[model samples]
Target chain A: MTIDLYYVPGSAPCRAVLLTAKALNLNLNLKLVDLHHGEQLKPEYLKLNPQHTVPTLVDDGLSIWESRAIITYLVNKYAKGSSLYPEDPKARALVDQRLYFDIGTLYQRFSDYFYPQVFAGAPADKAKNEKVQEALQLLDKFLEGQKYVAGPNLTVADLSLIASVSSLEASDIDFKKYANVKRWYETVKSTAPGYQEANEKGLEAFKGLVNSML
Target chain B: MTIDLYYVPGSAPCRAVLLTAKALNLNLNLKLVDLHHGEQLKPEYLKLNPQHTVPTLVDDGLSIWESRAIITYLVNKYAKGSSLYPEDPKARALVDQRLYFDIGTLYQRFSDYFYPQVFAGAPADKAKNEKVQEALQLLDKFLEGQKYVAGPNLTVADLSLIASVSSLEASDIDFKKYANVKRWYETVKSTAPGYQEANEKGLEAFKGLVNSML
Candidate 1:
């Protein structure tokens, strides 16, 4: 059976799925959607995914989206015994919690700062930027002495969050201000299966976009 | 071991957890924090939860926040055999996707509309309001042929989203505009355990707050 992925390189959500596919050693027939060119708005793409969001996966006739959900499915279906996503309820709860933190708090804060400035031509709001810093503070506290965000093991939660928090590399924000996050990012960058192609390249793409904006 | 839930009745997230706990028949020692009085910012509260977000659950010495994550944890830890959260990878993935949609799109849009107007005394952005309509439209499409948000059975994903989308009653907007969502919302309201005290009463609290503001 063939697995298909509809994605954009610069999207952090898409990169999260790319990293998961790499770790799972699954071949994805990649279809890059050009949001700038209005590729995602086309009727065919919208029919397949009503949300028209990137990182949509079609596996064995079933379609799915949401990067964190895709990663969870990939691990559950293919890497059932892998430590990448633990099955132990307690161990998995921490992973799920961290993943939610990445989406709801970390990435949400980043979008709050990025979208209005870049897309709507509004100046960055200082108060909104402070909210992002507060999110980072929470991340640092979560990673206090742990080697990974969830626990000591390198789970898909790290892959998802690494895709998120590392996007600051594209902007002027400094990760060093968040020591634990910085430590974890560097660690994951060196060790995660597809850090170079799946994440860093996409991150550079994001940086180029940010450079054009700021 | 005891489970403690720190919450505010007016918050949608806390209500999601309340529904999940009621479904599982687990007793939660409820602790309500008053946001208006700065109770969440107190040192003792801040010590247990640095993020200071409501719907924080402390279960058997492990502290977890994020409403979706808390419900996922409760189902996995306590209701493993229950259909409330399916075990099959495909089914679970669909549930996870809807849960992500709740936090990232639906609830996020509601907050964007409500917060600036309520907290900062700013008017709602027309464009932002349209984006919320688009989100609700997609939700309507997804529920066109389904019994629940995820699949045929009622899952925690439904619980999470009901807490999110039903807040439209408090606003001037109408859920009946999205017919499928309205049908699903009514079904969940009628069937989900603890709908009266856990969700409806809190929704009334939200409505009262909205009335005072609008």
Candidate 2:
């Protein structure tokens, strides 16, 4: 099946999908949707995605967004039986839990601390930064005994979290204090294939944007 | 299999799982983890979930948190191929997207607006309140052409969103402005099984907490 990914390189969620595509050895036709230029809000893009957000995957007749959902569907449709997303109910559930954690807790906290500064050039607020760190502390704890965010195997949850945590470069938060998360980040950075090109480089585009805000 | 749920009724996420358990006709041993008293942060509870959050599900030997993830696991393991969570990839992806929406966008916004005012007795910020309304607008858009959030059938995604939206009642937001959401919400309030006992009444506990803050 042909997959067209509408994304901007700077977005963590888009990079997560790219990492998943790389893991599956699938060539995703990347159409850069310029959020800066309001491309996503255009009538054509709105028809495909009412949310007007990036990293929308149009597979044949189906359109999917939300990087986690898109990546899960990719694995379910293309990479069946792959350890990238396991089959066992219990195993899958843990991964699912972590996926929710990244989006709902970690990434959401990051965006709250981040977007205001980027959009309006807002001043630093201690409470928002502390909330972001709280989420990171929880991530550190989850990675305490595990090599990956979910379990033993390298799953899409790891891919998603890596993209999320790396974006913290913009925040200038010292992650080394969270040893488990710091260790896990490096391990996944080195171990996960296409990470440098898919996630690392994509984040550079965002780092640049965040730098301007600072 | 014996299932144990660590929860407090005032929590929206906990109520989501409660609604799902009722829909599946599964009995869950509910253990109250009082956030107000910091029971969730106690050493014993912290061992099970280092994140120190409620609605943590213990199924057999596996401990799962995150309401969306726990409900998905329950459906996957117990009620395989159930229409509560569809089997189709596209259909399931839509549901997954909405689940992420509930946690990342809708529920996150709810907490951001509600928490500071509740805890510190802070005055309401117009900006934060508008952001909460923005999330509601998106939910209304999601419910536009569909009877339910994801599809024609009632799904757990609706349960999750219902829990999140109801939590806003404590904030005293006028939901009538979003007609589609108001309509769908009222329908779910009446139609979904055990919604009154599982979700509606559970929200009363939250309503009291919000009233105190107001």
Candidate 3:
């Protein structure tokens, strides 16, 4: 009954799976994939995940990646009746929409703006920064009346998004001006299970990596 | 029982939903959102979808955007127990992975490479083209031994991906060298329901838009 999780601590997507595992009270056998050394490019690791992406989860005989997919699959298989991912069609759809928005818009925009600056030592672009800000503004509007990213209660969408939002914070994006996002960020930070070890510590590590580039 | 689909024919994500609707034999009441004229930015449309992305589905009173979310939700709520999206945890996880890959990697890369050139008259960059090629290579690998993107059967993953692949074709990406992807593209086109109306026609419309930019 062991689920193996291949991850890197400083990676936001990896932290997302860790947070979900903690939320579900599932113990995962964590294996670190060293990207700096090209460890994920090895033949054996490629068989496990062709994309060589972090936060790949292997349970029973199945190996799956993509943070959103892994988190939802975890809840679907292990915590069927859990509220983290609701079974109601509408509720689940909202959660899925938010998850897609995070990966496709928020996190993607954040990566677009900062990844080159942090990893490749490229200069920042104002247009990319504005896109990130626009994404944050939309996220703030999403949280205008709702307590969480999806709805009234906390779901996996909140867990997935907090990982990305925290990464943005680590990268020094000033998201606090967006009041709803600011409030939701603080609320999730305080409420999610094992928040410190699962997210905060890793966020500090990510910040350190970003600082290394400077 | 009506499903209102707000879409623009040339948008790949919108066509993904249309393909999925056709696959599942679901009738969609189509509403065109004129992005060039700022129709999606209207107050009422924003009320229906805050993100204002095309392919927003409003069924009953539940309005959901994100093409992947809409397609999966339609299967979950309307076509329960159908194999278009499998019920097995592992099977569904694979499907989910492909869907995420389409949005996050394949389609995203396509958009990155071609959108600026077509929309803003930006010159093509070799680096972005390489990224798109890498993503297509990955897709080709995923389809190596399978008839469909996820597995043996035609699932929502296939429907979603074909829309993107077709769009890339329209954009003149020259993906014909990716043998597996090319074969799968042909296979899905012949097998999928209403492939002509669902994807081919829209793809032609997309090609016309690209030509207009040229």
Candidate 4:
């Protein structure tokens, strides 16, 4: 079965899906949706995804958006082993808990702080920055002594967390205070194949886009 | 096995999980999180979920957060047949797409317009309200003929949508203009066992809390 993955390079969620497909060795046709040029907001793209977001996966005749859901679908359907997503109920739920935390809490704070400053060319809101710092501190506390979000085994949860944080790093956010998160980020970056490459490309692209606004 | 579900009455995600459990006839220990009292943000509850969110499912030594992930886990581990979540690839992908849209787009817009006005006692931003109205209109347009969000079968996606809109209705937002959404909401409310009871109880508690605050 063939699939088309629509994404923009450097988008954290897009990178997560791309890395998942790469790790699983699944072949997918890549279509770049240039977020920088307002391609996603155009009529053609809105028809495909009303949200006009990135990392939309079109499989056969089905179109699935949202990075976590797409990754879950891929691993559930295509992946051979239980390594990526554990089948054990408790272990899998732990992974899921972390993934949701990332989306509902972490991603919101990161976007609140980073997007306005980086993408919208707006002044940094100090109140929002403080909130982001609180989220980072929480991540550091949570990651203490844990190899991954749900413990030692590398699961899809780790991928989601890494994807969200990579954007913060690309935006030149300081991570010195978040020791555990910093260590965890480096470990994931080095171990996960294509992670470093994706981040590097993302950082360069983010810089170019942010610079253009200046 | 005994399970405890910590949730608020009107939370869509929580309602979705509760409905899945009830539909499958699984016994669940219900604990109201008392969102109105700021119980979710208290240290006791935050210990269970640092995200301080509702609809947390604690079962068999596993604590699952995130409404979508929690519902998915419950259905996969417990439910039978095609009651809530479908097993088919394309069908499931469609559900995932809607859930993501709810999270990334619809929910955000809803909160932007509703939170300040309802929760913070601040005036509603006209621009934000317009955006939310646009999202609601789009959803109404899409639900023109479909029996449910994904199809004729009332999937978890519908549960999530119903839950959110119900909360809006309780806040005194009239959805009369969105006929399709209102019809689907009523249909799901009547057909889904335990939905109306839980929703009514939640609305009552919220009203009480608002009165207390006044």
In candidate 1, what fraction of native interface contacts survive? 0.71
TM-score quality measure for candidate 4: 0.90
lDDT of 2 by residue, A107-188 (tens): 8878888788888888777888998889988888888788988889899999999999998887757776899998999899
Tens digit per residue, CA lDDT, model 3, B98-148: 999999999999899999998889888899999999999999999889889
Return the TM-score for chain B, candidate 1.
0.96
lDDT of 3: 0.90
Rate residue B209 of model 1 by lDDT.
87
DockQ of each: 0.80, 0.78, 0.84, 0.54
DockQ of candidate 3 relative to the true structure: 0.84
What lDDT does candidate 3 reach at residue A134?
92
lDDT for each of the candidates? Answer: 0.87, 0.87, 0.90, 0.74
* Candidate topping lDDT: 3
Give candidate 3 regions above 4 Å deviation: none
Mind giving the per-residue lDDT tens digits that candidate 4 earns over A26-140?
A: 7889898877788989988887776688888887667777887888788878862557777665666677667666776778888878787765678888888888788788788
Chain A TM-score for candidate 3 is 0.98
Superior by DockQ: candidate 3 or candidate 4: 3
Task: For residues B128-152, write the lDDT of model 2, one tens digit per residue.
Answer: 7888888888888888987899889
The Cα error of candidate 1 at residue A106, in Å, is 0.9
